[PDB]
Structure formats: structure tokens, C-alpha cells
Design a protein around this ligand. Sequence first.
Ligand SMILES: CCCCCCCCCCCCCCCCCC(=O)OC[C@H](COP(=O)([O-])OCC(O)COP(=O)([O-])OC[C@@H](COC(=O)CCCCCCCCCCCCCCCCC)OC(=O)CCCCCCCCCCCCCCCCC)OC(=O)CCCCCCCCCCCCCCCCC
Ligand SMILES: CCCCCCCCCCCCCCCCC[C@@H](O)O[C@H](CO[C@H](O)CCCCCCCCCCCCCCC)COP(=O)(O)OCC[N+](C)(C)C
Ligand SMILES: CCCCCCCC/C=C/CCCCCCCC(=O)OC[C@H](COP(=O)(O)OCCN)OC(=O)CCCCCCC/C=C/CCCCCCCC
Ligand SMILES: CCCCCCCCCCCC(=O)SCCNC(=O)CCNC(=O)[C@H](O)C(C)(C)COP(=O)(O)O
Lengths: 178, 459, 128, 103, 603, 88
Amino acid sequence: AFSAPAAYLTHQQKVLRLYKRALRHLESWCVHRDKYRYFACLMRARFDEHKNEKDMVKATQLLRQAEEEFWYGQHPQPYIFPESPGGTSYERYECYKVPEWCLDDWHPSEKAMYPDYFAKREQWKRLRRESWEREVKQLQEETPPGGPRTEALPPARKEGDLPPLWWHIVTRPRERPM
Amino acid sequence: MLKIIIPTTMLLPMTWMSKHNMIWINATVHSLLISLISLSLLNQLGENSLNFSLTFFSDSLSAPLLVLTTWLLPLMLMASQSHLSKETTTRKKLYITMLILLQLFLIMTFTATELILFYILFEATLVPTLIIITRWGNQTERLNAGLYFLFYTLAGSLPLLVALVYIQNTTGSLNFLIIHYWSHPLSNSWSNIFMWLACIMAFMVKMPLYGLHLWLPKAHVEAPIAGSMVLAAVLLKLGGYGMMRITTILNPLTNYMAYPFLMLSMWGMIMTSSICLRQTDLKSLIAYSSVSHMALVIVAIMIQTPWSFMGATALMIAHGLTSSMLFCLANTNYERVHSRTMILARGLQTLLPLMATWWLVASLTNLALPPSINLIGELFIITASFSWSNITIILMGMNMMITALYSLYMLITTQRGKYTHHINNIKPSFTRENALMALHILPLLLLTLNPKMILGPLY
Amino acid sequence: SFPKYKPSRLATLPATLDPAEYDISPETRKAQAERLAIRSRLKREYLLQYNDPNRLGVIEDPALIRWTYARSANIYPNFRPTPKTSLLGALFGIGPLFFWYYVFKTDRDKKEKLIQEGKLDQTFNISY
Amino acid sequence: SGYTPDEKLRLQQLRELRRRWLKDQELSPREPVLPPRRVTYRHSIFAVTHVLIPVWIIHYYLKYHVTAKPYTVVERKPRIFPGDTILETGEVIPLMKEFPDQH
Amino acid sequence: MNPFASLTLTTLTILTIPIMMSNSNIYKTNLYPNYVKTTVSYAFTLSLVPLLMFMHTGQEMIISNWHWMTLQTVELSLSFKMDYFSVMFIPVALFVTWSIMEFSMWYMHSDPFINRFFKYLLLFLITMMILVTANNLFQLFIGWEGVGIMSFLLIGWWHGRTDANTAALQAILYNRIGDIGFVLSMAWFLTHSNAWDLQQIFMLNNECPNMPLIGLLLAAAGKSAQFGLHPWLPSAMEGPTPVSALLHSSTMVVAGVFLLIRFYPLMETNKLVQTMTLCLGAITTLFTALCAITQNDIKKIVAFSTSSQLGLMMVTIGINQPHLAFLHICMHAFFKAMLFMCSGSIIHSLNDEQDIRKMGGLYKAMPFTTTALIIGSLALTGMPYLTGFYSKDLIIEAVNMSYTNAWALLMTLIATSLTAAYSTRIIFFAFLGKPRFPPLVLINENNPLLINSIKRLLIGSIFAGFIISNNIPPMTVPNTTMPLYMKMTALIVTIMGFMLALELNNTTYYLKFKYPSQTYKFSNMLGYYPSIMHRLPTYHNLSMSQKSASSLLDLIWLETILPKTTSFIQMKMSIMVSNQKGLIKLYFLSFLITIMISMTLFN
Amino acid sequence: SDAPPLTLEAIKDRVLYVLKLYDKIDPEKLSVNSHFMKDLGLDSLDQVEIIMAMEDEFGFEIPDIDAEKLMCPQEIVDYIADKKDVYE
Ligand SMILES: CCCCCCCCCCCCCCCCCC(=O)OC[C@H](COP(=O)([O-])OCC(O)COP(=O)([O-])OC[C@@H](COC(=O)CCCCCCCCCCCCCCCCC)OC(=O)CCCCCCCCCCCCCCCCC)OC(=O)CCCCCCCCCCCCCCCCC
Ligand SMILES: CCCCCCCCCCCCCCCCC[C@@H](O)O[C@H](CO[C@H](O)CCCCCCCCCCCCCCC)COP(=O)(O)OCC[N+](C)(C)C
Ligand SMILES: CCCCCCCC/C=C/CCCCCCCC(=O)OC[C@H](COP(=O)(O)OCCN)OC(=O)CCCCCCC/C=C/CCCCCCCC
Ligand SMILES: CCCCCCCCCCCC(=O)SCCNC(=O)CCNC(=O)[C@H](O)C(C)(C)COP(=O)(O)O
């Protein structure tokens, strides 16, 4: 989720993803641990048989054919972690995620409470104002001509520099704000 | 009746002789006082009417509409106070003058002992609305919307004047009391058919009827907040009041005549409620919901039974208040976002909780949740239609379901979910906006305690 | 072999079962590269407009403006009277009206006849 | 595979900045500065102000306003069994037909 | 003076005081949930008195206190019915709500909006009391819509979650589908009977026609989640566990069955509607049990159990036994509410884990929840002398000893088998095997709130059936004689289900794996009903709503007819008339033509 | 909840625990910064099995894109700390 995506998925990426999906769905099928371990090792062994195959056409024939088998026995109700995109608590706490700039709209009587927090916030705002002005030039000079080719950002290269476009990545609300 | 009219007229010199920074304060206070004065008219009799003079009378169909018309002006002033801040004093005074003139025309329209006076004021209300729409409008299509609104109305109403003068030439009087006591049956003739059409289509266009409802989305979307409020709350009810007043002369011709309209409205409520489901605009969605409600009111008036009339009156009042509240909420969102599209600003409940509560209450009262007067009118009209025919309920059923859907859809798209990351100019809701919503919503929940006060003369 | 999965409109083809993905060519790779280049350029523009401290307003989205304008205001100027348009409009705008008129007219005729002969048993019916 | 060196360095800097922000999110012991300004015992008062008071109003409202109007409160006309006597009249319902009793 | 009325109105009135104080300062403190819980407990112990008065005498009453608007002959008033059903259901609902709030004080300990949660719970309780005590149809509709709106609000408690909002809108949609039939019934009753009052309707309807009963049945199917409109009840599990335990399990979802019970004098006089109710209940209980026996989420399994119990309730209604269905409602409330208490305790102890694949040995790791769940499962199945036995055994006997459908009876027996099946499935997959949760063990129960709340419902689910059955007056003819094999049919079916499902689950330890069949896929995806019916109609609606209603007619053809045609015609006429080159030659030739035409035409 | 506030020390301890119960690695040779491909001679499939173990240990699952480019216990700990917002 954090890393930028690639222009495509290689054959080894596809086989690894298929291995991951198949092993997760077999764990969903095999509730008990010993049965799952035995069948997972049997599946791993079966998987490793075609490991040294060099024919690309044959390589294409492998896995895609397996994918059809995976689709046939894909356990229509697989196990999903609670916070995963299919879990029962996927977006439970998105309603508690309040943006940071909202604090700029607080009444002064409210800002009277928590003064140290707002002082540190002012220091953060100063740092952002300087760093963004540096980052604009840094990204303008480092970006390839004709526009970027991959949505990955370069790190900071000087001493006082900060990572470009950092304000909204560092200032995430929290995973569980309340 | 002059105890209400004269203060409304005096509102104009008071506004124009006001200090440059005291117009809003003076206007709101005196408008609220005039509204309080209007409350006296509510104490109706089971007898004929409150005939003040030869020119004006009151009725328990006219009294709730008059009270609502008076109450709407302070709300419109408070809503307009925001976006007219960078505006010269003369033009703000002109805006307030136009609002006052609109109120005066509506007040004289609702009493109107005589039909030609009623028509004159009914069409006099057109000029201030047109000027408000085409002058203090944001987009470039306000001119086209004003043209549509003017010409639909005039095309509908020009035959009405000819029909009225013909009716006075034959009968000898256009007075409401004389017409009611001397009503005689209309023979099923081609000339009588065209007279019926001329008498009915003018009020049908302003409801508006499903076939003739195009002007309304344009006018509502392009008008300012005060214009949208006055269009949705009062100006749509003029057609219903006119139909209830003029239908007495029409019988027994109405039964055969009513079928094209009954079918158009029963299918158009479904069509417009379904249109509401796929909309990218708040104002258009509210406009189409208004069209559906007024189609139901058309059905109620055309059935022409006592329960139909009581349901139509209650539904008109409830829809006026609810639609004004909905437009106010949409305008509060727009003044922050400047986009007026639902899908852009999302998750506003996290940032504005009290405004989300107001949204929930408005959507619930638009959904016709009992024992609100919205559902009182809904149920009375549904029962009358069922007595008219046991099949109508099916259509009504669909309508109710669809209504709820889009209502909660509008509640879910803008208030629930995740707030858009980029928008950062969402400031805390002002006291003025919260007061506006409270003043919109409290009368509904007060009226549900005394439903008979808005059930019309057939109670 | 295993039973084949047949895609439909509301149940599309799975991502890993498309025959097109396994057919890889340099042209396809270049197409994906330029697609991701456009996506990354748009992302870079949005983040440049997003991160800036000075900006204190909604970022305007030309794609959303185009979507709304095409959905609402670009329909009629691109309308052409066509047999498909004519027949679909006539059907969907006239047929339901006449269907419901026929249904209600027949129901009310039956009720009126039953009340004329009087075999309707309208006892206790006092509210209408 | 794995992270590229530039990715490593960028992740390190962003992560240290994130920890600094998170550490800055903590409160000092004096942070909630609250300004003060004003102008069986638990179950004893509550049973009076939440049970005794409400039943006083309702019983008064029922006995004196609702039952003033006819047919507002209607009872069941409780069952009458043979052998019972009625206080208002004093008569006794005669017994039954002495059915043969066995098992 | 006759404290029955004063007490039975005082309970409902004092149930509203915390809503009044919700604007006071106590709402901003951490003592608000305890305030609401104490108010509910006092309401329950105060409503216990009218129940005792009914048990002693059988005293019945109607309280029409406030006169609302009167239209012509018809009169609408604030009228409360305190019949056996109301005075019996109120204490049970209040006790369940007290236990639910005691559990929720611990389950929602870390929820920032806990006062609002408690407020939402109290509002739902008040609205359901309004629904239960309603004497006229308008007040009953008020409660009907209020419980639905509170369910919509509580399901989408976490409004940042898309699926919660989707489930809430689903519940609203299905409840409006039922509302159609409710409104049809109200309209028919007002038009024909001239009143919405219960007394008048019974009096003027000696042989009730089909239409009002069909409307009532449609409303009951909508609100009780019958087979036609079932999926919203399983989809409602998106809300917090207390919400699923209070509303969607034991109090709210019996609204349709309760409504059909309210109109039992008119139900018994019609034979077709009884058959439809019986068949609907049978198919619903079968389908829901069949879906339940194969689910992995514990909340889904227990919700399908609730839906199957509702189907059994409507089966009881269809055979003209409304009082026994009410007894089933009262017993099911107790034991199914305690079942959700156990499930929520497990979920909270396993760090918000709901899948049974990640829970193993809990018989010893957590014993009190274990014994509570065991007792609840035994009561659900119907163990002799347990709370379930008093109601469910009589259900089976009455269905067997009645002139009913053979298919409905068979489906009811199979539903009992599947009930035993998913009960033992829950126990086996949550309690017996080796642990399967993440290594960091956070299992804890030593909390007074959870233990007390569970044990109160434990005492209820042990003794309530006995005490209530032996305290209520007799209301139906018993099946006092019965074949020995047919008397033991319920027990033999339950034990057969136990043993067969236990044997089928015991083969999972075997080191053999095979792909699933078609029956398992059909039962796991809920008969494929939620898929097709939630993708085929909606799309076909929404697309039309944009293509035909919005663009084809409104944006194009309605615009083409009146405004655009007028604009084009006027433009063409103006262009033709005004396009004169300024040559007086043509003007005067036209003058000559019109002069001669006038000389030839007008005389 | 009643969940203790886990720290970097606890995360790293549990990571090394899971790695030492991985019998394909002798415990005395591994280290915090020890690579997976070269320092331990593990297959890519072995690395994704390590990802399996991590996901089953911490109760959350890592996306495939991030998982496939995690080669050291230290960077895995850093990633999981970033996900869980760990202070110290
Ligand atoms: C009159 C004399 C009275 C005495 C009668 C006889 C007494 C008893 C004799 C026993 C008779 C059979 C009882 C055994 C049931 C089968 C259990 C079994 O082996 O399941 C494994 C096996 C497949 O397992 P798998 O795929 O490997 O799953 C992988 C793991 O096991 C995954 O496992 P998992 O861990 O995920 O979950 C395990 C779960 C998952 O297992 C399942 O998949 C469950 C699915 C099958 C079990 C449901 C049986 C209920 C039958 C009601 C159906 C109503 C009609 C539906 C109409 C459909 C129309 C197409 O299994 C369970 O929890 C237990 C299953 C339920 C058994 C407990 C109660 C059943 C006994 C009661 C039945 C009737 C007696 C009534 C008593 C009253 C006396 C009259 O299931 C089957 O082979 C199906 C067998 C029967 C299904 C009938 C439906 C076939 C429809 C084909 C087409 C027919 C023509 C239609 C034409 C219509 C055109 C208009
Ligand atoms: C576009 C969006 C909606 C706009 C508003 C639409 C609503 C207005 C439509 C008017 C409804 C019908 C008008 C006349 C109805 C009369 C009844 C007639 O239809 O029934 C038969 C009439 O037969 C035929 O209909 C004769 C008339 C046929 C010519 C009319 C044109 C038909 C289609 C035109 C529709 C266009 C309307 C819009 C114009 C701009 C009965 O036969 P008959 O017993 O002999 O006549 C009885 C009447 N008498 C007693 C006075 C003699
Ligand atoms: C969409 C609205 C519905 C339109 C339905 C019909 C549209 C087609 C008609 C186009 C205009 C036709 C103009 C000529 C109509 C002639 C009718 C007529 O003359 O009847 C007058 C009749 C009897 O005539 P006498 O000679 O005096 O009687 C003595 C012998 N018995 O007297 C009257 O009732 C006068 C009333 C004026 C009739 C109204 C004429 C206009 C058409 C009616 C209105 C319908 C269109 C409304 C437009 C809708 C736009 C929002
Ligand atoms: C329960 C649901 C059922 C699911 C069905 C699943 C079917 C399984 C059978 C599929 C058979 C195959 O192996 S699919 C055959 C695909 N072709 C190849 O594997 C050729 C070269 N292999 C690689 O390149 C890999 O990456 C590798 C070297 C393994 C590691 O790489 P690392 O060194 O970079 O970790």
C-alpha cells in the first residue's frame, strides 16, 4: 500500500501471488493446524516441481492453468483478517479520523487548553513552510523531463532537506484515534 | 385584513430609510412581528369564512398559507444575509424590497375575494421572482431559467384570463361566495371541455404537472437561496390553492376530465422519485422531490373528496417547510464548497455534527416519518386514492419506498463515509445557520401536536 | 479439467482468468508503461497542488466537471432524432400512461356497475 | 527484489519524521487546563424524583381528568365463577349441576 | 384508584426521562450509561406489578387518555392497550434491555460516543414500547417506523464504513416493502370499517376479506425477515454486538409476528391467509436453517437462527395458535439474547475476531461464557424442562396434531434437525478443538458487568418458561392424548440432528481433503439469493432511472416537444418575415396583390 | 480492547521468536539485520512463508506489493511499526 506500483507484474510476482492466495484459501479450507500443515507442505512440494523449468511458453502454461484450478476450489467464504479490505472491521474507525487543519479553526478558549501542543504545532507549521519551498525546487530539478514515469518520490539529498511531499504522510491522524 | 397588509407595505420605507448597516436587523425584527400578527387569522370557524370586507376574506385553507408566507420572510432574509456581504447598500435594499413585494403580492393573492383580483396578483408574483432569479444569480443559465419560468407560466395562464372573463360574462359575477352558492352543473360539451382545460391548466403548470415540470429544475438550481426558498415553499402552492378554489364550478365535468391528469401525476411521481436516485446535484434532487410531492397533491385535488382536500393542505404546508429547510442545508454546503455537487464534499458528519443532525431531521421529515404532518397528508391522500380505486395503492407504495431511498441516499452521500482529503476551508457552522435550521424545523414538530390547524376547511 | 466459469454483465471475468494478460508483447508493455506514466503525472500534479501550505481551498477537478457537464448539459445538443430514440421515447413515455389509464378505467367501470346494481355491500363506508 | 537504496533512505527519513510527530502528539501533565467557575442515599432521591414524582402526576391526571370523560378507561368486567358473591349486591351465584366425580 | 393504569403508564413515562435529561449536564459525564441502566431496571421492577395484578385477576384495560384530531365521524386519540400481550411482553423486553445495557457498559467501554449509544438504545426501547402498547393503527405505525429508523441509525453506527451504510439502507428498503402492505391494511380498514381503533375493527369484521389480511401478512413478512425479504436480517450484523443482541434478535424482529398476533380474531376467520402464513413460515425457517448450518461467522449463524425461529413463530400463527407463538416470543427473547451475550464476549476476548476458524479451545480457557453458551444452545434445541421446551415442544405437538400441510410439517421437522445441526456446529467449532487464535493471549472475563448481565439471563433461560407457563391462565385446548412415537418426535429429531452433525464435524480431523459439492456452495452463498436479487433488479432500476426517466424523456423529448419546437418555429417565422431586402418594388407588388385579394374575398 | 501498548522491543522480540521457531534457519546464525536471500540462503517461497507467519502472528495481513520487497527482520519491524503507529 505504501510503495508505488509497477508498470506490470512479472511471472515470478504472479506465481508468488498465486502461491499466497492458494495457501490462504487452503488454510481457510483446513481449519485445524495439523491438517493445514500437512496439506500446505504437500502443496509446497507440488509447487516446487516446476521450479527449474526454463521454457517461457511452458512457464506461461504453468500457473495460469493452476489459476483455473484455484478459481474452482477457492472456498467461496475465505478467512479475512478483521482490518483487511474484506474484514468485519475494515473501516470501523474511519469516522474517528479528523484532519489536522481542523485545529486551526478552534476557538481561542479551546486553544487555551493544551498550549504546549499548539506551540509544537506552530513549530511544525514553520518547518513545513520552509521545507515545502525547498521541496518545490528539489522536485522540479530532480524530475525527468516530459513528466514523471513512475509515481515514486526521491528522498532528500542535502543536510537540511526533508523528503518531498511529506506533510500529508507524516501527519496521518492515527490508526485508532479514539 | 389590512392589519397585516399595511405593516408589510411599511416594511419598504423602513428598509429604504434604514441606516446602511441596520437593514438586516430592522427587516428581520419587523418581519417576525408581522408574522406574529398573522397568527390571529388561524382561529377559524366551522361556518362559512372570515369575511373581513368585500375585497378580502380568510379561510382555514388560506390562513395556514398566509402564516407560512409571513413566516418565510425572516428565514429568507437570514439566508440571504450571507452571500450579499460584498454588495452595495442600494442593491441590498433592492433585494429586500423585492422580497417584501413578493410577500405583499402573496398575501393579497391568498385572500382575494374576486377571481380577477386573484389572477392579477397571482401573475404579479411573477415579476419579483423573475428579477431575483435573473439578477442575483451566479451561473450564466439564469437568463434561460428565467425565460422558461416566465413563459411556461404565461402560456398556461393566458387562456385562464379569457376563461374568467367569459365566466363573468355568462354568470355575472367572479366573486367566490356568489360562485359557490350559485354553482350550476356544466354539460359535457366541447366548449365546456375547453373551458375546463383553460380553467385548470394554468394552475396545473405551476404545481407543476409531470408533463410541464421542466422549468422548475432550472429555476430552482439557478435562483439564489431566497429564490429557491420562496419557489419551493409558497409559489408552488399557488396552483393547488387555485385548483381548490376553482374546481367548484367545474363539476360534474371533472370526473371524465381528470383521467389524463391523474395518470400523468401517478406515473410522474414514480418517474421523478426514480430520477432523484441518479442525480449529481443537490438542488436538482430537491427540485425533483418537490415535483413528486406536488404530483401527489395534484392527485389529491383531482380525486376531490374531503380526505383528499385535508391531505393536500397538510402535505402542502409540510412540503413547503421541508423543502425550504433542504435548500437551506444545500446552500450552507455550497457557500463553503462552491461546487454544489454531492460527490465532491463527503463525510461532513465528522466535521459538522450538529449540521449533520439537522440533515438527518430534514431527511426524516422529507421521508414522511410519523407522526409528522408530512405523513398525515401522505396517509390521507393515500386513503382517499384507495377509496377512489384499490389499485392506486400499488403505485403509492412504490413512491413511498423510492422516496425513502433517495432521501437516505442524500443523507449518506454527503454526511457519511470519509471526508474529502483536499478540502480544508470547511469552517465551523455559524450561529445564524443553526438558528435558520431550528426555525425551519421547530414549526413542523409543533404543528404535529395540532394537525387540525392545517387540515383545511373540510375538517 | 474443471468446469468453466462463464462471465456475465453483473459478474465480470476474473482478473487472473483473462486470456489477454498472458499474451505479452513489447507493444503491450509500452502501452502499460505510458498508462502508468499518465497516471503518475496526474498523481504528481495532484500532490503538488495538495501538499502546498499556501493553498486553502478545494482543488478543482476537471474530470469531475467534465463528468457532470456531460451528464447534465451535453445531452440535448448531441441528440439526433433516430428510430431507436423515437421508439424508446414513445414507448417509455406513453405506454405506461395508457396501461394505467386502461387498468383504472376498467376498475372504476366495474365498481360503478356494481354500485348501480347495488350488490356491493358498502355498509359502514362513511369516509371517502 | 527488495527496497532500492533511495527507497530505504526516503522511508528512513519519513519514518523518523513520523515518530517525531507521534511523540509530539503526547500531553504534558498540565495539558488539560480546566478553568473553574460556578454560580442508599443515591437510590433514595432517585426513587423519589424518577418514580414517586412521575406516578403522582399520572395518577392525578388519570383519576381526575381522563376518567372525568366517559369511556376513556374501560376495564374487562372480571370473570364471575359459580359460588362467588358480589360486594355491590350481596347475592351468590348458584352452584353447578353436581356432575359425577370419579378420577 | 385501580393502580393498574397508573403503573402501566408510569413505566412508559419514566422510560422517557433520560431522553429529557440528554440535554442536561449528566449527558456530558461518564455516569450517563449507568443512569440509563438504572432507569431501565427501575422501569422493569415497576412494570412487574401490573403483571402480578394480571396473574391474580386477569384484569384488562384500555386507556384512551389524550384526544387527538377527529375527522368527521372518525376519532383519533392517544390510546394504549394493556392486554395480556402488552403486560406480558413489557417486563421481558425491559429485563432483556437491562441485561443488554449492563453488557454494553463493558463492551462499549472504549467507544467515544457511548452516551449517544445508550441514548439510541433507550429511544429504540421507547419506540418498541409504543409499538407494543398501541391500541389504534396510527400509533402502531408510529412505533413501526420508529423502530425501523432507530435500527437504521444503529446499524450504521460506524458511518465511515461503507458496508454498514449499505446494510442500513438494505434494512430501510425491505422495511418499506413491508410498509406498503401496512399502509394498504390501514387504508382498507379505514375505508370499510370506518375506524383505525382495534375494538371497532374486531366488531365490524366477522368474516374478514382477503385484502387487509394480505397487507398485514406483507408487513409481517417485511419486518420479521421472511423468505421473500430475509437478507436484511443477516446483513444487519454490521452493527455493534449490543445492537444485534437487542434489536435484531429478540425485541425488534418479532414486530411482524406480534402484529399478526394482535389481529388474531380476524386471522382465525380466514383460511387462505392462514395457509399462506404457514407456508411462508415453513419455507423461511427451512431456508434460514439451511443457510445457518454452513456459515463461519458466529454472528451470521446466530442471526440465521433468529430468522428460523421467526419462521417457526409464523408457522405457529398459521395453525391458529397465537398465544403459543407469543409464549415462543417471550422464551426466545431470553435465550437468544443470552446467546448473543456469549458470542459478543467471545468476539471481544479474541480481539474483535468473529470467524470461528480462529477460535479453538475455550471450554477451559474461558468457563463462564462456556457454560452460558452451553445452556443457551440446550434451551434453543429444546431440552425437556428447559425454557425452550415449554414453547417449542408445544409448537411441534400443535403442528403435528393439526389439519395442516404435509410439506410444511416436513419442513418444520427438517428445520428442527438443522437447528440442532448449527447449534452443535457452533459448540464444536468454538469450544472443543485446539486453540487457533493469535499467540498473544488476551482472554479475560473477570468483570462484574458481563458476568452479572449474563447470569441474569441465565436464571431467566432456566426458570422463566416453567414459572410463566404455570402462572398464566390456560388459553387453548391441549393435545392431552398422542401416540407415543409422535410424542417423542421432537426429541428424536433433535438427538438425530445432534449425532449426525457431530459425526459430520468429527471427520474434519481426518487428513483427507476434497473439493466442495454444489449443495455446499448453494447453502454457503445463501441460496445465491443475495447475489442475484441484489445485482439484477437494482442495476435494471438505476440504469433506467438515468437512461429513460432522466435523459430520454426529461432531458430530450419533453424538452423537444413544448419549448424547443416553439423556439424553432418562432425563429423560422421571424427569419422569414423580417428578411426583406428593402425594395419597395416587392412591397408594392405585395400591396397590389393584397388589395385585389381583399376586393375579391370580403364582398 | 484492554490491549497493552506494544513497543518496538516487543515487536522485534516476537519477530525473532517466530524466526527462531522456523527450523529452516539455525537460531544462532540469524540476526536483526540478517538478509533472507543471501545471509540465510532462503527461497522466495520461504520468504513468503515467513510473511504468512508474520501475518498470523500479528493478526493483520501485509499487502502483497509491500510483502514481496521485505528481506530483513529489521525492515519488517520498521514497516509493522509504521503500520501500528509505534512510539518507542
Ligand atoms: C420417515 C422416516 C424418518 C427418518 C428419515 C431418515 C433419518 C436420517 C437419514 C439421513 C438422511 C440424510 C442426512 C444427511 C444429510 C447430508 C449431510 C452430508 O453428507 O453433507 C456433505 C455432502 C457434501 O459435503 P461437502 O461438499 O464435501 O462439504 C465440504 C465440507 O464438508 C464442509 O463442511 P463445513 O465444516 O463447512 O460444515 C459442515 C456442514 C456442511 O454440510 C452441508 O453442506 C449441508 C448440506 C446438506 C445437508 C442438508 C440436509 C437437509 C435436507 C433438506 C432439503 C430440503 C429440500 C431442498 C430442495 C432443493 C431443490 C433443488 O454440515 C453440517 O453442519 C450438517 C448438515 C445437516 C445435517 C444435519 C440434519 C440433517 C438430517 C435431517 C434431514 C431430513 C430428516 C428430517 C427429520 C424428520 C423425519 C422426517 O452433502 C451432500 O452430499 C448432499 C446430500 C443431500 C442433499 C440433498 C439436496 C440434493 C439436491 C440435488 C437435486 C435434486 C432434484 C431437485 C429437482 C428440483 C427441480 C424443480
Ligand atoms: C405534454 C405534457 C402533458 C400536457 C397536458 C395533457 C392533458 C390534456 C389532454 C386532454 C385530455 C383529453 C381531451 C378531450 C377528451 C374528451 C373524451 C374523448 O377522449 O373520448 C371520446 C371522444 O372521441 C374522440 O376522442 C374525439 C376527439 C379526437 C380528437 C382529439 C385529438 C386526440 C389526440 C391529441 C392529443 C394532443 C394534446 C396536446 C395538444 C397540444 C368520447 O367519444 P364522444 O362521445 O364522441 O365525445 C364525448 C365528448 N362530448 C360529449 C363533448 C361530445
Ligand atoms: C397543454 C394544455 C391542454 C391543451 C389541450 C388542447 C390544445 C389544442 C387547442 C389549441 C388552442 C385552440 C384555440 C381555439 C379553441 C376554441 C375553444 C372555444 O372556443 O370554446 C370557447 C367556449 C365556448 O365558446 P362560445 O362560442 O362562447 O359558446 C357558445 C356556443 N356554445 O367558451 C369558453 O369556455 C372560453 C374559454 C377559453 C378556451 C381556452 C382556449 C385555449 C385552450 C384551453 C387551454 C388548454 C391549453 C393550455 C396551455 C398549457 C400550457 C401550460
Ligand atoms: C485451495 C485452492 C486451490 C488452488 C490451486 C493452485 C495450483 C498449484 C499448482 C501450480 C503449479 C506451479 O508451480 S506454476 C508454474 C509457473 N512457472 C514457474 O514457476 C517457472 C519458474 N519459477 C519461478 O520463477 C518461481 O518464482 C520460483 C522459482 C518457484 C520462486 O522464485 P524466487 O526464487 O524469486 O522466490
